[PDB]
Symmetry: D2
């Protein structure tokens, strides 16, 4: 009958979303608004919201239901629609000039295993608002949850009158189909949301490519910060979706003056402090791999789970695992994506800033600071040059939750569009009405 959006071949998946895009060029702005709203109701439906949130966890073995229940709702509510497509206007003696945001064509989107449903909802809303179709390439670990969402969207858009196959994917998401999608001529723009290997891959294809890379965000806490509030926002921001967010705090850098009071307020807020060098080393055997990287089995796991594996039984109060280590520690250097939070002590905030730049590894992604000194907040904000910089709040404030602005799950650091929206999936066009319609 109607297409379910899922095809057996990447080539005809691209050819199907290529025909959809052209048909989609006949649909009015109001059609886009109904389609965009149709995608919101699909995920914000309470039966679907709870279903995608827990099933993703069931299939990926990462994150938790309660938090992807919030993240999925953030992608549905705070993702911009067709209002994002603004129009610049310049009226003068030479008439008028309009600048619009117009469809690219067909977009290929490569989505991660840390925000499988969130990224698809966030991409599809923006890419369809800008008048594009999208060919998705999900991470094969999130294959089942992603295609089902792809299918749920196709059904809703069919009931609204949309052209078939505005959102599509493949039945067997693989590394080969992802490469196949990057090579297909009809694909006009690529959007990559993942690690450094995939971001550099879409940049080598001869096509327009949005690159959302990895992070390693430090959170500086100087003597000026509200230590009680700082330690609360840290635990919440680090335990959020079990540290899967690319913004989630992954190492603490505190000045010696307030460090012991920070650790005390951190434990008070649900941190389990590891002080014995043996159980710490015992923890490194659990969560690390060969080549000193993170184990995907431990990635996205809870603090209850990780301490269960080293013979420590704690209740549900424990949200993170705390330890004060040197800066060379692998938990500091690596993007653990786990509620494991090291803490490096430094003499002054200037040393905390100069170190936070180093452990950023030039990712230019996310950095957090707790401090009420404007001069010190703007010195770190200027020097580290990250795409998102949160101040006196949990890191998820930079995604629109607890912070001002809209929400996105594709954050462009390398290619540099920042928090991508519908403007990011559109071509910039200029229209010059010479010596007419200067009605000032």
């Amino acid at each position: 009958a109607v297409s379910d959006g899922v095809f057996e071949t990447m080539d005809a998946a691209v050819e199907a979303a290529a025909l959809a895009q052209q048909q989609y060029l006949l649909c009015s702005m109001s059609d886009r608004a109904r389609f965009v709203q149709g995608i919101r109701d699909v995920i914000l439906n309470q039966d679907t919201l709870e279903k995608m949130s827990r099933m993703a966890v069931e299939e990926t073995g990462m994150g938790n239901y309660e938090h992807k229940l919030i993240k999925n709702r953030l992608a549905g509510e705070k993702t911009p629609g067709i209002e994002d497509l603004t129009t610049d206007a310049f009226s003068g003696d030479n008439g008028l000039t309009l600048v619009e945001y117009s469809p690219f064509g067909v977009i290929g989107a490569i989505t991660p295993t840390t925000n499988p449903t969130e990224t698809i909802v966030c991409n599809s809303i923006g890419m369809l608002a800008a008048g594009n179709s999208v060919v998705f390439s999900p991470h094969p670990r999130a294959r089942q949850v992603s295609l089902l969402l792809v299918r749920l969207i196709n059904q809703k858009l069919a009931a609204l009158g949309a052209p078939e196959n505005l959102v599509v994917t493949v039945e067997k998401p693989s590394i080969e189909n992802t490469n196949a999608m990057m090579a297909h001529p009809k694909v006009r723009m690529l959007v990559a949301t993942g690690g450094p290997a995939i971001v550099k891959a879409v940049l080598s294809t001869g096509k327009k490519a949005i690159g959302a890379g990895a992070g390693n965000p430090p959170v500086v806490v100087d003597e000026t910060a509200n230590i009680e509030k700082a330690a609360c926002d840290i635990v919440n921001g680090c335990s959020f979706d079990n540290n899967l967010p690319c913004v989630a705090e992954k190492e603490i850098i505190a000045v010696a003056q307030i460090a012991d009071y920070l650790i005390f307020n951190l434990k008070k807020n649900g941190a389990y402090e590891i002080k014995d060098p043996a159980v710490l080393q015992q923890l490194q055997d659990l969560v690390l791999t060969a080549k000193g990287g993170p184990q995907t089995k431990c990635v996205g796991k809870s603090a209850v789970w990780l301490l269960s594996q080293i013979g420590i039984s704690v209740d549900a109060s424990i949200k993170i695992i705390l330890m004060e280590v040197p800066r060379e520690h692998p938990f500091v250097q690596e993007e653990l994506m786990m509620p494991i939070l090291p803490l490096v002590r430094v003499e002054t905030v200037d040393d905390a800033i100069d170190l936070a730049i180093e452990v950023e590894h030039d990712n230019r992604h996310t950095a957090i600071m707790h401090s009420t000194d404007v001069r010190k907040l703007t010195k770190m904000a200027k020097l580290i040059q990250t795409t998102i910089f949160v101040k006196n709040g949990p890191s998820y404030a930079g995604l629109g939750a607890g912070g001002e602005g809209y929400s996105t799950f594709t954050i462009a650091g390398p290619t540099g569009e920042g928090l991508t929206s519908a403007k990011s999936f559109a071509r910039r066009r200029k229209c010059v009405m010479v010596e007419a319609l200067n009605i000032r």
Copy 2:
């Protein structure tokens, strides 16, 4: 004090990298002083006219008095640091700021079409955004490009700028372009040229902006002002000898006004060719062995072209006109010459459809002349070009006779449009949670 011109490619890259790391420690007023310095170098009449002849002399393309306007339009209507605006959103959750920060060192590739205009354009926009620019000019514009880079480097040193903000190579060539592409220390690539260099910077694993080519059609219908349309068409097509990426390249005339349009094209300096044999002869000259325009004719005047087929002509003639079918290579192949075929159609509604077809999905430039709002709306929306000019010459889309700012790096494939300082900057967010909400 360095001159901004280095012996090898790795030397210029490593010096711009040290420059931008030092450029970061500057203020916005320093950026504004260096921006004005770049404007001063080209807008100086002594240098302006030197840059306009050397480009015509060395490359052998265009004329000097039109490059006089193109070089001026670049240093005059290019956005400066005022292009870097700030977005703010305040409420219960605090204050959000969105800024345009530096990328780092930018590698820039320029065409033989507009050597100096593109250097002036990229320098202002990239340096205003806090970047440094490593230019890799075409070998056929080498000596004028190196002269302009040194004049800028000289000027900026007298303003207190860190050295090597604008750098280039002593021996520009194809392989120096490829060494700038592979250099890990280049953060952004901007390419203003053919379709092969654009896909090459798009295949290097780097952030790349590609300003592609086109084939701009101009549609005329029974509703247009025919006298002003034929003046705007000849002026646009013959601007800098049809070198600009925006200049008209073929006409599509509604049959109802096609004859009266051909008369007013003549009255405004168009030389029509009616004998099919003399129209063979120019196909022999400008089109070469296997169907592509010949680089020796590209950028030459209409008088120079008519002389090569033995037609001595006064400087009144600005273009070579001919009524011709839609399959003739003069309509399909981007000539970049003051040769302007015309295709006659019955209707305006597939005058539009024919224009979309001959544009060849470049979605670059299209022009239309008329009085009906719905018809200008219909063609401007369906053809989906980056620039669409209504009731004026093509260069009106460059800030010359139209509203908006000026650019010589118009990104088609990569979607930035008329690139400016913002186009060469990283969008960064800054969230002050639960503070600075002063409403």
Copy 3:
């Protein structure tokens, strides 16, 4: 071509107590978050967009005022509830450089006194309250006596919803007996920081002579110009739909046609084709003018907002419900041209050229600088009359209500300020601009 182309309830017995209660409401509103404002604005929206009260509020205004029709007011009440800007209208400007960061913000005014008309009684209460409360203000309403009960009723459902949402009491207040005296009482109260007048030229003249900041949304007399290049078929349909909209009550609705002579006759045919009753007999035209005009040359109160079928019945002409307006071709000095009848009566004046049309439309506008419409296809003539007539709203090739967001691009409003320069008023129009300079800090670029 001759063818064209193809807990308090909110209501107080005295005016002063309404202001004193609205001032106390301002004190407490300043302690409420933007989310509270958003929930209170969203509260008002549910008040009018709830289908039962939506039908309910529409029949009232027709029953109490005798003006307009029910189905079109069902459209105007929904248009105010949906397309009026909320707290998203309060945007922020930011400037960042070497000297730090400067923000400019829209901040509340305090207590606002709003004077509403009888032609749009509930639409203006919805629209004023949304933007005024979104900007962080409290509003005192002085309704027109003719639409007393429908206005009093809406303000009570508003005070009930907001209370149920935890809003400070008396955020939106009014008087128990609206009167011109209670209007002058509001104009003179020192606690009222701003005035907003939506009515005739006399009420706008008053608010600007009180010693307070005032937004004056005055009257209109919009002409509609059709030249030989217009889509005459579409022109006639838009003109009849726009003129008859809510029985010509809107300040935007068409009031007189200025048609180029070449297409004027074909235009009339397509006006009749779309439900215009053409009056040719000199005598029966006198009957309507004797019925519609008063001794002072102004419109008849008992006839304002009455249907075209109702007006034709009173002169002894029975017609079916397909007739929406009344059409007569008359000279330019005819009263129906010079007066804002606010009735489905449409005069047409024929002119030689489009140049003459643009000039007479300027002459007929009466310097209201409010609304003007022109159906035309040439960009140069559209540009000429738009730039020249200088109206607050200018509509091209559409119905007049496209300047309200109905079939046009933008937000809706029912307070359209011309002589005071605010344009189509929204939350920004009801707020003060504040500049916050952070010297040599927060420049993070």
Copy 4:
């Protein structure tokens, strides 16, 4: 050629009436040329200096060196035609443009405090908007305003402007100010002065912009850079001898750092009066029987104010500093003298609430020196002034040391804020139904 100055108010208005009609036929480039002409007038060095001595000498208020900075600030950072932005939104129902269009003839009433800065600032804003301006300046600054207007007409005459775009009366007074406000052909009033003239223009049945007065307090808290705070408060309070409506007029310092603040304020040229006998001598000198400021002392230097009480000191002194209770008249009155009282409070929240109290709900200007981003936000969000400067001099709220544009007409009651060209324009909406939606 007319010089713009007329014998009667009615003759000036009618001249500005017909001039504004003729103005409506001019282009944006024409407006741009006239605006730049008014910039060149005041920014000319000899004219910049001339205006500044002539004002001080004719009014007896302010100092030369600071009115040099301020007159430069009005011609250099006042918005031009770039201030008149266009809004636009397109979709299915077509295109909608929003534009800023001129009112008509505007009447502007300038004050003695800044006679030249307001004429330069007003005239640039209202001509940029396409309006004409009839000026009714203060009689105390009578000949400096007519010479400034005359010099302006000569410049506009040379540029090709319609005669009498900026006009004034030969004999300024308040009698013809009323004539201006009661003239049918004036369309907006712009009153820049005290609370009387503001309510006067708002009672005329006409659109009016009223820029009232204020009593700006500056709050210092324990987080403030005391060496930098004490420096900025002296530069800001003694700026033009406290004449600017923005200039600090009383300090509210927390007890923790109040003595070290006064310690560092004297390093910057403060004179502490500790003997109530000497202090009362100032009181009887500068206040009035009913406690108002004395016109003879307004704008007088601190050196001169101390000479009227015998105390002789050099020009190193810039202000007269006194620690004093809150109810004292120096705190409560907009003195516009370099007299700066200090009110010590215990906590920053006492300072915040007190600065709210002494501001008298003028909601005009307030300053705060502090490093805590929470306290800066708390006072800004509560005092609700149209200018709020943080960690800098008062005049940083007028583009001199801060971000943004400058103005000299600050609308507090009427709510326009820092009036620019946009303030003197009507918003018009232009709806193209079902056309020009080319997205």
